[PDB]
Design a protein around this nucleic acid. Structure first.
Lengths: 63, 106, 180, 384
RNA sequence: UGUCCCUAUCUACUAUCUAGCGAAACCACAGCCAAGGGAACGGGCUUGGCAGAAUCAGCGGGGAAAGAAGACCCUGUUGAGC
RNA sequence: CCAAGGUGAACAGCCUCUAGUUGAUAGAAUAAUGUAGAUAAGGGAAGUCGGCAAAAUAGAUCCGUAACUUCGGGAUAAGGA
RNA sequence: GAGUAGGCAGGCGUGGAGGUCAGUGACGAAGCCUAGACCGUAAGGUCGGGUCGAACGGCCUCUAGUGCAGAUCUUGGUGGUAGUAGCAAAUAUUCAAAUGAGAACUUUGAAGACUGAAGUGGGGAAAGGUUCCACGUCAACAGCAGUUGGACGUGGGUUAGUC
RNA sequence: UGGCGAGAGACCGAUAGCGAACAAGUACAGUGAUGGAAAGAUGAAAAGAACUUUGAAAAGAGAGUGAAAAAGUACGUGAAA
């Protein structure tokens, strides 16, 4: 139950911040056993980890 | 004591009337827990994360005047407490949570 | 070992807790609230004072502390709810009660006959005061040790005679009042 | 050296100590001088403060600038539902003052005055005055003996009398019991009146006439600690003052090398047993009457109760008294109104008051209208 | 223009109560007054007044309260800058 | 050292995106006195050593601008819309 | 038959020293504790009881780093104040699950917020020196807590013809 | 009053004696020159507490070792505040 090396690794692997990394709250046993960067790369393909799409900043009121 | 599910209205307006603005939503959480205790005689309340989102959606200082919520007194498990029943509060989805009297869902 | 007791070791069980990091003054007061009780009434009372129903009456270390209504039970005005102390002595009540069962004492008449809280060596930290001074910041840990004995009535019955000494005048007046 | 500029002292040195009047009742410390000629009657009367309203009246004061001119006066109303007689105490005069020789009660005391004697009532078996009520088993032998005692001895006679809190909008149930002295004929007449009125109610129309002065006695509003410059209202020290303005600067000198009793000091004030004098009776209204608010110059079917009820208190369905000016004590409080200890004859007494109009606008705001009929008439007819 | 006549009210954070953690200054012994005498302004002495456990929040009269072998003045057959 | 969008003269203040934190003992209650913010009828420095503190004024466009001057200034004078 | 400053005399007590009592002593020396006892005007001495465990004493003499309440004495320890003052500036946290003996503080999810690119972003200089990272773990430290950590235990890690 | 090797004492006996009886000019302070501690004793022998039971654990109560645990690696004796 120490997935901070997994948040850090996920963020660095996918190529976004640690603020844009959703680890699966139901699938915790698997993301604990994730140690390598290759393990994280496999879990992002399964969709256990995602990119958690950008907070939109509309330029509509600007336009 | 029985296993029941009722739908209550709570006047959060009069319960949060004259509170510090940055402890209004946290006080609303604590006063719904006190409300669930009063009506279900239960010392364990379990606010749904959906009810949390409902109280907090309009910031720390914008708690809606009234809230229509559902309180299910349920048989307890999970390392048996001193209280054999716990109350699980959820938010009911009504467009205007006003003019509604307490009912029972079966 | 185990400070002065006037009870029978054949009918006793004890429990010791050395260098326990609790406020000495708080844990002296929980011990003096629980002293000379039944072990059942004692155990129940310590769970009540954890969930804020009854309070530990602070008698000696009762300086500028807030008053409370839960003191009226004990004829005091000032009482408190030392969670940490209550939890440590609870651990030692339970452990004593376990030894008292393992030796074979009826758990019903089992009443706390001796409870003593001594001071441990103080643990050393340093605080930092205005104008670049250092001060001490000391914890005062505790040496708790308690005894639980079986209750027995039918005592004293004690003790001595009227082994009397009299004069010729006394004994003569006794012999007279008999003749009367 | 001396003050340099001498001012009069802050605070009266007579209303001390400024502590919390031990009771919550008012505690009448003096009754009138006890006239032995005129018929037996109650002196003071228990009641409950409801709230304040405005009145308008013509003014008979020859020499005054406002002779024969409408004047607005503030008025406070006291709910006075008939107070039930439940006892009579005999007091003998001694070289250590008056002392209670004995008290005798009626066998039937209402659940109202029974609730008084318990603090955890609904757990109780309600066994109060069971054996005392069973002393009326035969022809009240114990009663006739103790009443014969109070007749033979007892140079003073007082009545134990309790309020009817069930009739008030108050949520108490626990009727305030009080002693109230009888000022009437021979002690035998006083004992017989206190007996004959057992288990009966006494109303306010008997005790208090109209245009008669009254001494409102009550405990004031709380306010808690209420710091230095509000209880005596001493000077606020200059903006530049370090450690606080809201204070008294110099307690005292040395020699005497002690803080003094005369010095103004901090600590709880408000909730003191106060007695105000010369409150002229304006209305003694009845509960057996709609058009309580109706004067001889209005004739409108409204009650003294404003629109939306007396704020914080409720509706006044019982016989009441509205009295001129402010009287001490909060709303929902237990007041005792006592007759004048002397004959005030200062042309403010002897002065026959005739009311022209009573304010019944909703004083839960800046109410425009006196009655729902006027609101509907002026506005309307939307939208219900 | 609340600086003031003249104060009032409100907000937040304190204080307050609780759980936890937990110092320091100071401390002859200590802690009720009046007068008296007295190192000429007493907590203690003499004579009076009196005097009832345990205490909580405040307060700034007193403890000639605390901080520092007066820096002013003098002395010293003590120095230093000028 | 690198340095986004909007308002705006602006790298000012206020709000957001990327990225980053959500750490500073907590719970309850809202007395006095404080500390940091505020408001006040009428009067308007009477307060006070002393207008100390606060209040008022404020951006931009147009109008207008005195004594004095080392003829450069004063000057955003003042006073308005 | 008083007595400060002061003088002198007679003794009491301590560390050692020479001589002696063929001194006492593991069947208990010395030390310490003692609302027990006896002697002495006193300094002090002697004895009983307890704890303890390896030495010590009377007397005749020699010798002195030889007797404490004060020195804002020294060192060390301890208090009363006192569970008091306080742990209140950087807007703010809340719900659930998981973990665990234990969760306000840990991990994840979900909200609500802030820093607002002259930042609470991303690199560096000097300075530090392994704090970096992993696993195991919580007696001490993180002025609450602790399962967490810049802590604790064991390891792993810094690659240059062009910087 | 140095260095090396030896004999000694009416000396000191762990706040004494050298600053240092101990991993002492050590730890540590200061930029630097320099400043500079505290800290010895279980028992004859570790025989350093097998094994049982309460507790998550530290530990507790037993059992045992020992001549003694009123010797438990917080260790001879264990004063006073």
């Amino acid at each position: 139950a120490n997935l901070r090396t997994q948040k850090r690794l996920a963020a660095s692997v996918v190529g976004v911040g640690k603020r844009k990394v959703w680890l699966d709250p139901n699938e915790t046993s698997e993301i604990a056993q994730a140690n390598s960067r290759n393990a994280i790369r496999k879990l992002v393909k399964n969709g256990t980890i995602v990119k958690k799409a950008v907070t939109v900043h509309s330029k509509s009121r600007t336009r | 004591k029985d296993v029941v599910t009722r739908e209550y209205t709570i006047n959060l307006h009069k319960r949060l009337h004259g509170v510090s603005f940055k402890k209004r939503a946290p006080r609303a959480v604590k006063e719904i827990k006190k409300f669930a205790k009063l009506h279900m005689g239960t010392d364990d309340v379990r606010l749904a994360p959906e009810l949390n989102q409902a109280i907090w959606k309009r910031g720390v200082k914008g708690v809606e005047y009234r809230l229509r919520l559902r309180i299910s007194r349920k048989r307890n498990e999970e390392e048996d407490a001193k209280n054999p029943l716990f109350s699980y509060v959820e938010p009911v989805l009504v467009a205007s949570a006003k003019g509604l009297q307490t009912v029972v869902v079966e | 070992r185990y400070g002065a007791t006037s009870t029978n070791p054949a009918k006793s069980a004890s429990a010791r807790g050395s260098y326990l990091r609790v406020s000495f003054k708080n844990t002296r007061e929980t011990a003096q609230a629980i002293n000379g009780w039944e072990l059942t009434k004692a155990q129940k009372y310590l769970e009540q004072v954890l969930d804020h129903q009854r309070a530990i009456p602070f008698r000696r270390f009762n300086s500028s502390i807030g008053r409370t209504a839960q003191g009226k039970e004990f004829g005091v005005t000032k009482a408190r709810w030392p969670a940490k102390s209550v939890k440590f002595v609870q651990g030692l009540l339970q452990n004593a009660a376990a030894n008292a069962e393992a030796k074979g004492l009826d758990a019903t008449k089992l009443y706390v006959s001796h409870i003593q809280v001594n001071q441990a060596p103080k643990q050393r930290r340093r605080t930092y005061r205005a104008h670049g001074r250092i001060n001490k910041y000391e914890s005062s840990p505790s040496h708790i040790e308690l005894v639980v004995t079986e209750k027995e009535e039918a005592v004293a019955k004690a003790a001595e005679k009227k082994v009397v000494r009299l004069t010729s005048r006394q004994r003569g007046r006794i012999a007279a009042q008999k003749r009367i | 050296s001396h003050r340099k500029y001498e001012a009069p002292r802050h605070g009266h040195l007579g209303f001390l100590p400024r502590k919390r009047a031990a009771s919550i009742r008012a505690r009448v410390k003096a009754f009138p001088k006890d006239d032995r000629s005129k018929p037996v009657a109650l002196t003071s009367f228990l009641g409950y403060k409801a709230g304040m309203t405005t009145i308008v009246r013509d003014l008979d004061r020859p020499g005054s600038k406002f002779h024969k001119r409408e004047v607005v006066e503030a008025v406070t109303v006291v709910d006075t539902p008939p107070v039930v007689v439940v006892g009579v105490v005999g007091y003998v005069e001694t070289p250590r003052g008056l002392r209670s020789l004995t008290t005798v009660w009626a066998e039937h005391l209402s659940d109202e005055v029974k609730r008084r004697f318990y603090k955890n009532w609904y757990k109780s078996k309600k066994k109060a005055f069971t054996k005392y009520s069973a002393k009326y088993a035969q022809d009240g032998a114990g009663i006739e003996r103790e009443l014969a005692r109070i007749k033979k001895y007892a140079s003073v006679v007082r009545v134990l009398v309790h309020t009817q809190i069930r009739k008030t909008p108050l949520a108490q149930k626990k009727a305030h019991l009080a002693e109230i002295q009888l000022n009437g004929g021979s002690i035998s007449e006083k004992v017989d009146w206190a007996r004959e009125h057992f288990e009966k109610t006494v109303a306010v129309d008997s005790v208090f006439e109209q245009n008669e002065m009254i001494d409102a006695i009550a405990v004031t509003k709380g306010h808690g600690f209420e710091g230095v410059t509000h209880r005596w209202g001493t000077k606020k020290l200059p903006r530049k003052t370090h450690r606080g303005l809201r204070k008294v600067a110099c307690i005292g000198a040395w020699h005497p090398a002690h803080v003094m009793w005369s010095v103004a000091r901090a600590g709880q004030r408000g909730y003191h047993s106060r007695t105000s004098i010369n409150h002229k009776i304006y209305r003694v209204g009845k509960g057996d009457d709609e058009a309580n608010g109706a004067t001889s110059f209005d004739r409108t079917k409204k009650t003294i109760t404003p629109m939306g009820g007396f704020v914080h208190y409720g509706e006044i369905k019982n016989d009441f008294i509205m009295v001129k000016g402010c009287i001490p004590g909060n709303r929902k409080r237990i007041v005792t109104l006592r007759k004048s200890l002397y004959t005030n004859t200062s042309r403010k007494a002897l002065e026959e008051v005739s009311l022209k109009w009573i304010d019944t606008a909703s004083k839960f705001g800046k109410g425009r209208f006196q009655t729902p009929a006027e609101k509907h008439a002026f506005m309307g007819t939307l939208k219900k």
